[PDB]
From Swiss-Prot, chain A:
Taxonomic lineage from the root: Eukaryota, Metazoa, Chordata, Craniata, Vertebrata
GO CC annotation: cytoplasm; prefoldin complex; protein folding chaperone complex; RPAP3/R2TP/prefoldin-like complex
Official protein name in the record: Prefoldin subunit 6
Organism: Homo sapiens
Keywords: Acetylation, Chaperone, Isopeptide bond, Ubl conjugation
Linked residues for Glycyl lysine isopeptide (Lys-Gly) (interchain with G-Cter in SUMO2): 54
GO biological process, one term: protein folding
Gene behind the chain: PFDN6
Shown stretch of the complete protein: 13 to 114 of 129
UniProtKB/Swiss-Prot annotation, chain B:
Name by which UniProt lists this protein: T-complex protein 1 subunit delta
Source organism of the structure: Homo sapiens
Residues of the full protein shown: 84 to 368 of 539
Disorder cited: De novo genetic variants in nearly every subunit of the TRiC complex, including CCT4, have been found in individuals with a broad spectrum of brain malformations, and clinical phenotypes ranging from mild to severe epilepsy, developmental delay, intellectual disability, ataxia, and other features of cerebral malfunction.
Intrachain disulfide bonds: none
ATP-binding among keywords: yes
Phosphoserine modifications at: 101, 119
UniProtKB/Swiss-Prot annotation, chain D:
Gene: CCT7
Residues passing through the membrane, by range: none
Originating species: Homo sapiens (Human)
Pfam hit, one: Cpn60_TCP1
Compartment(s): Cytoplasm
Record keywords: Acetylation, ATP-binding, Chaperone, Cytoplasm, Hydrolase, Isopeptide bond, Methylation, Nucleotide-binding, Ubl conjugation
GO terms for MF: ATP binding; ATP hydrolysis activity; ATP-dependent protein folding chaperone; identical protein binding; protein folding chaperone; unfolded protein binding
Matching NCBIfam families: chap_CCT_eta, thermosome_alpha, thermosome_beta
Protein's recorded name: T-complex protein 1 subunit eta
Swiss-Prot record, chain F:
Cross-link entry Glycyl lysine isopeptide (Lys-Gly) (interchain with G-Cter in SUMO2), positions: 186, 190, 241, 251, 255, 368
Factors inducing expression: Down-regulated in response to enterovirus 71 (EV71) infection (at protein level).
Keywords linked to the UniProt accession: Acetylation, ATP-binding, Chaperone, Cytoplasm, Cytoskeleton, Disease variant, Hydrolase, Isopeptide bond, Neuropathy, Nucleotide-binding, Phosphoprotein, Ubl conjugation
Chain sites annotated for binding Mg(2+): 80
Protein name: T-complex protein 1 subunit epsilon
PANTHER family in the record: CHAPERONIN (PTHR11353)
Pfam families: Cpn60_TCP1 (PF00118)
Binding site for ADP: 29, 81-83, 151, 398, 468, 484, 489
Function: Component of the chaperonin-containing T-complex (TRiC), a molecular chaperone complex that assists the folding of actin, tubulin and other proteins upon ATP hydrolysis. The TRiC complex mediates the folding of WRAP53/TCAB1, thereby regulating telomere maintenance. As part of the TRiC complex may play a role in the assembly of BBSome, a complex involved in ciliogenesis regulating transports vesicles to the cilia.
InterPro entries associated with the record: Chap_CCT_epsi, Chaperone_TCP-1, Chaperonin_TCP-1_CS, Cpn60/GroEL/TCP-1, GroEL-like_apical_dom_sf, GROEL-like_equatorial_sf, TCP-1-like_intermed_sf, TCP-1_chaperonin
Phosphoserine PTM sites in chain numbering: 2, 322, 515
Length: 102, 285, 73, 512, 510, 517
């Protein structure tokens, strides 16, 4: 029936990019290492959205404390969407199957 | 938990909190009348009349009791430092109490303003323990010895410290789990991930914008939530801070050093901020 | 349902209302001798009142007058 | 996996047979007790006959169940006669139980019974009194008396003959059944006892008074009768549906529509044929408009029996679907009139294309009086229809019983031995019926039955007890009248189960 | 035993008592169950349903005892009932009766073999003198009387009065179609009981009588290729989804029509294989019915296995659920395959007539099942007593005018042959009196009174007990000619049979 | 299967026949004592008559079960006498016990009871007056309209309901051809004022929907426009989303309301009234905006109520707004919003002089407890006049009639005799118990009371006197103003005699093993 995997998709969806963040998490701790060891030697742009912008150092720094908010925010929110979708998915499994069989 | 037994803990527990002492005696005074009271009851005396006869006659006894008594000098630190010591000498605990009588009586004498020496509330006293050191390293400190310290880029020790308190949530509002994002996709959240960013910083910016040299921070469980990326930027604003302190010790901190409860940037000025001449944590000993 | 005629009702009507009427006059006036309030189902928690309106609530009563006279109280 | 054998078991069989028999005993005469029967139901069940509780009764003696079956048999076969077949077996079982110790145990048992119940059916047929149409009567005048008989049974007014000749009519109309069903009486609470109408077509005690029911015709001389087994109400298409509003016509649309599907389905059978719309089940306040908005009569919450009566009399087919559209699942009376009779809003269906259901209107609104008359009418019907069905008749109150008993114990003298001991006790079987009635009629089963024996040794025509008159006399000219076939059939079952179960002391069971 | 070991419940006293006594228990009613029987027996079979009879085997199989004593001898009683339709009512009583002489001889202290062997040679002596007492032989199956004359004896040995209309009705079922020479069949002649009409309305339709509603039309051909099927309709509509009918609103549309065309193909494939009657132990469906009306293949709406079984048995049909196009393997057999109303019940009728293989199907119209099945019981065991497969049954006195002859024969001779065996040989001639008693039981007099007079009838073969008073006061009814004889064979077995287990069940002390 | 002896059952019968009969005997009248009901919920409740307490009391024995069955009918028709039959049942029955304990058939004497019924019924048929009339009955109404409102909720007898209750009857009395029903009149319990605040309505009163008072409160004409449909934009009494595209479109939204106010106003008005009950409840906005625009409509209404007002008008509801008709609107000789309660909004009073088959007395009460006890009170006096309007005949009874009807039957026993003689003797003594049994409930010797009028009955028969049910020093009936529709007592005579007969029903005392199981 349709109601099974509707929820498990966006489960699996926000699951992986969240885990992509875990790589980026180390990087978001390492970008706090990389930029903090950048005194303005190499031109620091934020890469934040599609516009690539002439940036400053605090703009570089405050951003990666804010870029960790990626790994902070996206990871956490999904653990909701994980079970938020998972339970309604698990719920709908036995209901509509037993019907169509019964 | 028999009710009569229930009262008798508070029998001492009052005497526990009354004098801090003599709590055996207050139990040892109990059954003495409890005998005599049943007697009167056995005599048929009416428990009111029984009662009625007592706090009446108690007022009598305390005088004659006080008639026996010798007043000492409460204004004199040393008299009491001789007397309570002699009372400590009348008691078991001496070794440290000997060492700690001056520390007690001085910490007392420091909470003794009056020549009466009032009640000397242990209220104004903060008894702090530090794991290292020795009993010799027990010391009386005239501004609050605070649990730990918490600073990311925050100044290790700020003099003249304006003591902030956070009764406000540093975390961005929680629209899904802890985050100002809602959980559906990657794209729509990153723009409101941008929102979680600025808000936690701004409130943090607002903190130092009304300004503090030190910030009392209760526990983040004593909070709804406190965003660390804000705090990561908050100590990055170079504010000396403590995090995770008792909101009850806060109430002690609020009253004793005058750093008053602050849920607001506005409640930061210097107003609810105690001004702490030397704020530093001692890792030593 | 239990049909309770005068025979059953009266005694039951007395036993609560009388003996609970004791408890209220038990604590009555300045010399009114307190009752330990029996917290029943919750702790023992000992409460001591000169007021019977307290007694009304603490121990639930099935005695109909004692039930009714809670309101009268 | 069980079994049992022997007189120790045999008397035990008989042991239960006597127990129940005292329930059917006076259950005819309404003086006694009755036991309200609560079951796992939890509900009141109260009888005029053991057969009702026999259906309720569950037996530890399946031997008791045997007589049940055969007591049920002539009962359900005649519509009555549990009391007959029941007491007949238990009698001899009582009678033979002392013999059992001597033993009747040799299977010489039935050889008595057969011949016993044999002489009588012969003796009964000669004492069976046949009747015809104009023979002694009008054949209404026959049933006039036969209905007068059971209407004169328990006290009512001169309504007896009033009810008698009347109820005879639809009898003479629909008589096929021995049953009163096709004629079944409508109790009307209201009116006068002088108000009663035997109706030649199905007449509905009640339909409900709706909104627009006042606007629905109470008169059709061509009712096209929709027999609806379901509800047509406001919830057929529910009238509460939420709507999005950028404007206020969105509400107007969602409301004015869901109201229509109500009208839609119901008007389909309406437009097809249906002027008389009969639901045995509720009609919603909004749908009865759509019923009346057409001004084709609807009746919801109507008697199922009347609804089934209609299918019988009116030629209609019961409809479980308004979405089923046709004129033969309708029915044609040529009379639909509705005149509230007493308080009941009251539908008249006659002019049925055949009218195989009639119903007798009884009014006066006296619950005590009328229901007793209704029980009185049943027996009148029970008599008059079966008084037709067997035109050979015979007098009640044991009119031949002392005679048979005499006639039977007359044959006793020659045998003497085990079967004479029956033939006398077989003769003794007859007095038990007036015996119980001697309780009811206020008599001495001791003194009276012998008087009737005497009055069958002196008389011997019909002479027997009248519980009605509270006297004893010829019951045929005391007018107590029943066919002899039921009594013949009483005999057939009498010895039958009797001789039957006594052939089993050897019983086998296998719950395993 | 004394030791925790030694599994057994039988032995020693409990052998010489309880075993024989437990054997005594069941033969008790078999006495009331043999010969003319006015007695009756309620039985609930683990339906809790009462049934009434005089026959032991119907009852005994149900009955469950600790001891193989009862559990064994029934097999011999079956072994009789297997070979001979009746006398099994008797076959138990004699052994149990003859047994209890041993436990007496055991109180008298006679050895196992000693007690056994006297019966043995006397049983041979019986088997020697038993055919000497053959008083007639049967003759002609085509004759109704020649058959019906006997048939009463066994129906008698079940139930007394009914036998008259019955025994005639039996040979009128044509026991005669089979020669009774090396062949005869119940299932061909099978009893088919129509509840309703009269019990004496019990009729004969040669050729199958199936009370099942006879559907479709009459068979496409009367030769009909007969494909019988256990459940050829499991439904072609599926029970699935939400309501145990439908789930989605779109569901119902495919449920309703799918049954049709499947059944259409199904009932077409009934015509495609060529079955001229369709037999559904599965459900009937009007479309399939109308298909069976189109394809004109007679339909059977529901089946007991007995239907399917006999159809499988007789037609050579094979009942199989077909959600599957039917395939004739079942094919045809019966040359005339009909619809009929017998008892005016729709009666599925197949008929084919052959000296062997002909169905001449007993149709019992009857007012009461509980009777008509026991009415079936006697005719059953009567025609199974007709089953000897000797058209000349070497008849001996029926209802036992024999025993008095043999009770005279042996124990007289029993002393002549000497030695303590003689007493077992003389005890051998005693339990003969059982049925003379067992009838005098249900007749109501003393077997001594019986035997004293029926020894006084001396060499007779005729006079003996029965029902009524002529088994009572004289104890004299002519059990050669009341019209009642019995075959030597069914008699011959009971002695032979009840010789074995009786002898056997004594030997076993474990 | 456990069969007991009818005797044993007759015990269980008589064992049940007592407390229930007893229940009334100190509860009879105001001299009787209140009947308390405590529930499966443990809910203390003061109860009345039989049927109130009898249904509340959980019936156990067949008698107890049969009680409520029989008992309902007396309060149905008459409204009173329900308490009596239960007393009367056991009283005679428990002697019928004693009579059967003499070794007497229930068979034989119960006829005599059925038969002594009629002769007491006929003796009753002598008693008091055969007539009441429209102005006459009012004082005998006032008599009972005293004691009915001088009994339960108050003993004060507000003449309000006393002459309000009769008027609803008197209004619907003649309507039914000297008949009435208590749907056809109605007690409308709604509080907001005390017992002293009551009403009689020729129709329905509903608290008129207003989403704002300043948006005009308008009631007019005589007529209501009855609608299942909107008089202002609909809504199924539930949540509805109201959205608009731009900032301005909120203004056009009200125009749609404003136009479909008048569009429905102008539609529904021309067909009569402007007042349209709308089963549809609406949001605050359009309601008051129509109250504003013109001509308030009633919203958030019971589907029954739009039906109730329709069947009250005898015309229909307008189901569809696309539809409309005058019959499908209201037939009302008045519709007025009238201030409802002291605590809340004006009620919309539909009093129908166009068509009303129902004329309803309305009652406020200071509590539900009292407004229900008055609601509990009224039906009695409501039902007695229901008897009156059919048969205006009343009998002075309660100590005049019992001993009266008993005395002749006491004498009839000796005229009749055998089985009826101890029937009619015992038949009589049961009657004489009730007035006796009042001095039971009252403060007086029940014996000497019965003795008292027993002397007076020897003195005078069927007296305007009687006992004191009000326990007045004078023992009267006329000046006690105690009395019953001779319908009622006779009807009350029927029931116990009916039931003490019903215990005799046929034979069967056997059960499957289940009779009360």
């Amino acid at each position: 029936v349709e109601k099974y995997q509707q929820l498990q998709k966006d489960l699996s969806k926000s699951m992986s990019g969240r885990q992509k963040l875990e790589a980026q998490l180390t990087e978001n701790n390492i970008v706090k290492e990389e930029l903090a060891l950048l005194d303005g030697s190499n031109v620091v742009f934020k890469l934040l959205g599609p516009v690539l912008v002439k940036q400053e150092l605090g703009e570089a720094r405050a951003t990666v404390g804010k870029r960790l908010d990626y790994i902070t925010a996206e990871i956490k929110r999904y653990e909701s969407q994980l079970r938020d979708l998972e339970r309604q998915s698990e719920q709908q499994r036995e209901t509509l199957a037993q019907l169509q069989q019964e | 938990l028999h009710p009569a037994a229930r009262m008798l803990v508070e029998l001492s527990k009052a005497q526990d909190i009354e004098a801090g002492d003599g709590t055996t005696s207050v139990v040892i005074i109990a059954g003495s009348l409890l005998d005599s009271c049943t007697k009167l009851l056995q005599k048929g005396i009416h428990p009111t009349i029984i009662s009625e006869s007592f706090q009446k006659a108690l007022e009598k006894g305390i005088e004659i009791l006080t008639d026996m008594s010798r007043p000492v000098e409460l204004s004199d630190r040393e008299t009491l430092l001789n007397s309570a010591t002699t009372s400590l000498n009348s008691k078991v605990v001496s070794q440290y109490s000997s060492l700690l009588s001056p520390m007690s009586v001085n910490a007392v004498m420091k909470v003794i303003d009056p020549a009466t020496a009032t009640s000397v509330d242990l209220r104004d006293i903060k008894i702090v323990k530090k794991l290292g050191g020795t009993i010799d390293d027990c010391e009386l400190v005239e501004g609050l010895v605070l649990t730990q310290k918490v600073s990311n880029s925050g100044i290790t020790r700020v003099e003249k410290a304006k003591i902030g308190l956070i009764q406000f949530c540093l975390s961005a509002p929680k629209t899904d789990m802890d985050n100002q994002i809602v959980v559906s996709d990657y794209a729509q959240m990153d723009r409101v991930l941008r929102e979680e960013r600025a808000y936690i910083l701004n409130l943090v910016k607002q903190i130092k914008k009304t300004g503090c040299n030190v910030l009392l921070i209760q526990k983040s469980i004593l909070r709804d939530a406190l965003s660390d990326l804000a705090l990561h930027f908050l100590n990055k604003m170079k504010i000396m801070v403590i995090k995770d302190i008792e909101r009850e010790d806060i109430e002690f901190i609020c009253k004793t050093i005058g750093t008053k409860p602050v849920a607001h940037i506005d409640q930061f000025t210097a107003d609810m901020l105690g001004s702490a001449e030397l704020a530093e944590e001692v890792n030593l000993n | 349902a239990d049909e309770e005629r005068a025979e059953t009702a009266r005694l039951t009507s007395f036993i609560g209302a009388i003996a609970i009427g004791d408890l209220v006059k038990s604590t009555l006036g300045p010399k009114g001798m307190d009752k330990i309030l029996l917290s029943s189902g919750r702790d023992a928690s000992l409460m001591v009142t000169n007021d019977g309106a307290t007694i009304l609530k603490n121990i639930g009563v099935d005695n109909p007058a004692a039930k009714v006279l809670v309101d009268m109280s | 996996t069980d079994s049992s054998q022997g007189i120790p078991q045999l008397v035990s069989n008989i042991s239960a047979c006597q127990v129940i028999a005292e329930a059917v005993r006076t259950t005819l005469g309404p003086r006694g007790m009755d036991k309200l029967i609560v079951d796992g139901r939890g509900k009141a069940t109260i009888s005029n006959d053991g057969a009702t509780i026999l259906k309720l009764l569950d037996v530890v003696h399946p031997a008791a169940k045997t007589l049940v079956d055969i007591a049920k048999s002539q009962d359900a076969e005649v519509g009555d006669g549990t009391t007959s077949v029941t007491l007949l077996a238990a009698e001899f079982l009582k009678q033979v139980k002392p013999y059992v110790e001597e033993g009747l145990h040799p299977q010489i048992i039935i050889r008595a019974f057969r011949t016993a119940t044999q002489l009588a059916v012969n003796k009964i047929k000669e004492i069976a009194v046949t009747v015809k149409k104009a023979d002694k009567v009008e054949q209404r005048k026959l049933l006039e008396k036969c209905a007068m008989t059971a209407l004169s049974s328990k006290l009512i007014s001169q309504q007896k003959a009033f009810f008698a000749k009347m109820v005879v009519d639809a009898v003479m109309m629909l008589d096929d059944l021995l049953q009163l069903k096709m004629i079944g009486i409508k109790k009307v609470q209201g009116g006068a006892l002088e108000d009663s109408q035997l109706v030649a077509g199905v007449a509905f005690k009640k339909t409900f008074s709706y909104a627009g029911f006042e606007m629905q015709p109470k008169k059709y001389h061509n009712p096209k009768i929709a027999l609806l087994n379901v509800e047509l109400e406001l919830k057929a298409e529910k009238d509460n549906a939420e709507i999005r509003v950028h404007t206020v016509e969105d509400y107007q649309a969602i409301v004015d529509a869901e109201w229509n599907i109500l009208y839609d389905k119901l008007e389909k059978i309406h437009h097809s044929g249906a002027k008389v719309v009969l639901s045995k089940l509720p009609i919603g306040d909004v749908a009865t408009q759509y019923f009346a908005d057409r001004d084709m009569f609807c009746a919801g919450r109507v008697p199922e029996e009347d609804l089934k009566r209609t299918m019988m009399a009116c030629g209609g087919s019961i409809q479980t679907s308004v979405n089923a559209l046709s004129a033969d699942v309708l029915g044609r009376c040529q009379v639909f009139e509705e005149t509230q009779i007493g308080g009941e809003r009251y539908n008249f269906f006659t002019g049925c294309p055949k009218a195989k259901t009639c119903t007798f209107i009884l009014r006066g609104g006296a619950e005590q009086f009328m229901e007793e008359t209704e029980r009185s009418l049943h027996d009148a019907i029970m008599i008059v229809r079966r008084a037709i069905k067997n035109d050979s008749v015979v007098a009640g109150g044991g009119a031949i019983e002392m005679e048979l008993s005499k006639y039977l114990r007359d044959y006793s003298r020659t045998i003497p031995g085990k079967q004479q001991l029956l033939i006398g006790a077989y003769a003794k079987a007859l007095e038990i019926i007036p015996r119980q009635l001697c309780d009811n009629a206020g008599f001495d089963a001791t003194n009276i039955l012998n008087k009737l024996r005497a009055r069958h040794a002196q008389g011997g025509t019909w002479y027997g007890v009248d519980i009605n008159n509270e006297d004893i006399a010829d019951n045929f000219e005391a007018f107590v009248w029943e066919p002899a076939m039921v009594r013949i059939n009483a005999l057939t079952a009498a010895s039958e189960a009797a001789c039957l179960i006594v052939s089993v002391d050897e019983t086998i069971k296998n719950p395993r | 035993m004394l030791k925790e070991g030694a599994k057994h419940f039988s032995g020693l006293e409990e052998a010489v008592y309880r075993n024989i006594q437990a054997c005594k228990e069941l033969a008790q009613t078999t006495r009331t169950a043999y010969g003319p029987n006015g007695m009756n027996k309620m039985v609930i079979n683990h339906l809790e349903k009462l049934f009434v009879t005089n026959d032991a085997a119907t009852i005994l199989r149900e009955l469950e005892v600790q001891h193989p004593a009862a559990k064994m001898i029934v097999m011999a009683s079956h072994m009789q009932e297997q070979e001979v339709g009746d006398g099994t009512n008797f076959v138990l009583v004699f052994a149990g009766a003859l047994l209890e002489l041993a436990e007496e001889l055991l109180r008298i202290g006679l050895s196992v073999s000693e007690v056994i062997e006297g019966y043995e040679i006397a049983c041979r002596k019986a088997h020697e003198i038993l055919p000497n007492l053959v008083c007639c032989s049967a003759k002609n199956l085509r004759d109704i009387d020649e058959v019906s004359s006997l048939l009463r004896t066994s129906i008698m040995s079940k139930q007394y009065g009914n036998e008259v209309f019955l025994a005639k009705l039996i040979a009128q079922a044509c026991v005669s179609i089979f020669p009774d020479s090396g062949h005869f069949n119940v299932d061909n002649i099978r009893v088919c009981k129509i509840l309703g009409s009269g019990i004496s309305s019990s009729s004969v339709l040669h050729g199958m009588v199936f009370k099942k509603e006879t559907e479709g039309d009459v068979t496409s051909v009367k030769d009909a290729k007969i494909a019988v099927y256990s459940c050829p309709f499991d439904g072609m509509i599926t029970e699935t989804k939400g309501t145990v009918l439908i789930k989605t609103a779109e569901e119902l549309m495919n449920f309703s029509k799918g049954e049709e065309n499947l059944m259409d193909a199904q009932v077409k494939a009934i015509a495609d294989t060529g079955a001229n009657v369709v037999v559904t132990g599965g459900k009937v469906a009007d479309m399939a019915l109308h298909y069976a009306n189109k394809y004109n293949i007679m339909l059977v709406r529901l089946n007991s296995k007995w239907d399917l079984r006999r159809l499988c048995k007789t037609v050579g049909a094979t009942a199989l659920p077909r959600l599957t196009p039917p395939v004739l393997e079942e094919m045809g057999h019966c040359d005339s395959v009909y619809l009929s109303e017998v008892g005016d019940t729709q009666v599925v009728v197949f008929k084919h007539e052959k000296e062997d293989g002909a169905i001449s199907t007993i149709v019992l119209r009857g007012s009461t099942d509980n009777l008509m099945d026991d009415i079936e019981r006697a005719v059953d065991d009567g025609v199974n007593t007709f089953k000897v497969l000797t058209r000349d049954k070497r008849l001996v006195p029926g209802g036992g005018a024999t025993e008095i002859e043999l009770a005279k024969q042996i124990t007289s001779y029993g002393e002549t042959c000497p030695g303590l065996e003689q007493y077992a040989i003389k005890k051998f001639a005693e339990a003969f009196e059982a049925i003379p008693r067992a009838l005098a039981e249900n007749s109501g007099v003393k077997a001594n009174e019986v035997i004293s007079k029926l020894y006084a009838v001396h060499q007779e073969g005729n006079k003996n007990v029965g029902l009524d008073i002529e088994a009572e006061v004289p104890a004299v009814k002519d059990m050669l000619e009341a019209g009642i004889l019995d075959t030597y064979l069914g008699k011959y077995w009971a002695i032979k049979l009840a010789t074995n287990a009786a002898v056997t069940v004594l030997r076993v002390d474990q | 299967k456990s069969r007991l002896m009818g005797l044993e059952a007759l015990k269980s019968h008589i064992m049940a026949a007592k407390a229930v009969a007893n229940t009334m005997r100190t509860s009879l009248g105001p001299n009787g004592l209140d009947k308390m009901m405590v529930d499966k919920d443990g809910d203390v409740t003061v109860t009345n008559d039989g049927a109130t307490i009898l249904s509340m009391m959980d019936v156990d024995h067949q008698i107890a079960k049969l009680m409520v069955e029989l008992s309902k009918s007396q309060d149905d028709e008459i409204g009173d006498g329900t308490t009596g039959v239960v007393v009367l049942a056991g009283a005679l029955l428990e002697e019928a016990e004693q009579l059967l304990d003499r070794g007497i058939h229930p068979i034989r004497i119960a006829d005599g009871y059925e038969q002594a019924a009629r002769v007491a019924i006929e003796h009753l048929d002598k008693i008091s007056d055969s007539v009441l009339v429209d102005i006459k009955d009012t004082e005998p109404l006032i008599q009972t309209a005293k004691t009915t409102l001088g009994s339960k909720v108050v003993n004060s007898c507000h003449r309000q309901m006393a002459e309000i209750a009769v008027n609803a009857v008197l209004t619907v009395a003649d309507m039914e051809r000297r008949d009435v029903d208590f749907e056809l009149i109605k007690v409308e319990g709604k509080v907001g004022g005390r017992l002293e605040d009551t009403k009689l309505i020729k129709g329905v009163i509903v608290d008129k929907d207003f989403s704002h008072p300043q948006m005009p409160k308008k009631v007019e004409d005589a007529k209501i426009a009855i609608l299942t449909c909107p008089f202002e934009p609909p809504k199924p009494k539930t949540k509805h989303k109201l959205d608009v595209t731009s900032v301005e479109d909120y203004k056009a939204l009200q125009k749609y309301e404003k136009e479909k106010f008048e569009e429905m106003i102008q539609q529904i008005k021309e067909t009569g009234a402007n007042l349209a009950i709308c089963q549809w409840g609406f949001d605050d906005e359009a309601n008051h905006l129509l109250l504003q625009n013109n001509l308030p409509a009633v919203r958030w209404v019971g589907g029954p109520e739009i039906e109730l007002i329709a069947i009250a008008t005898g015309g229909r509801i307008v189901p569809r707004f696309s539809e409309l008709t005058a019959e499908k609107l209201g037939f009302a000789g008045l519709v007025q919003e009238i201030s409802f309660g002291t605590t809340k909004d004006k009620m919309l009073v539909i009093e129908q002089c166009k068509n009303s088959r129902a004329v309803t007395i309305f009652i406020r009460g200071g509590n539900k407890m009292i407004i229900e006890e008055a609601k509990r009170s009224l039906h009695d006096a409501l039902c007695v006049i229901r008897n009156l309007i059919r048969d205006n005949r009343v009998v002075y009874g309660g100590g005049a009639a019992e001993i009266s009807c008993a005395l002749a039957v006491s004498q009839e026993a000796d005229k009749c005799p055998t089985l009826e003689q101890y029937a009619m003797r015992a038949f009589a003594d049961a009657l004489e118990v009730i007035p006796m049994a009042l001095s039971e409930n009252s403060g007086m010797n029940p014996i000497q009371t019965m003795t008292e009028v027993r002397a007076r009955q020897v003195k005078e028969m069927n007296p305007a006197l009687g006992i004191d049910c009000l326990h007045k020093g004078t023992n009267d009936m006329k000046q006690q103003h105690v009395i019953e529709t001779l319908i009622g007592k006779k009807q009350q005579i029927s029931l116990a005699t009916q039931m003490v007969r019903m215990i005799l029903k046929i034979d069967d005392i056997r059960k499957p093993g289940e009779s009360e199981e």
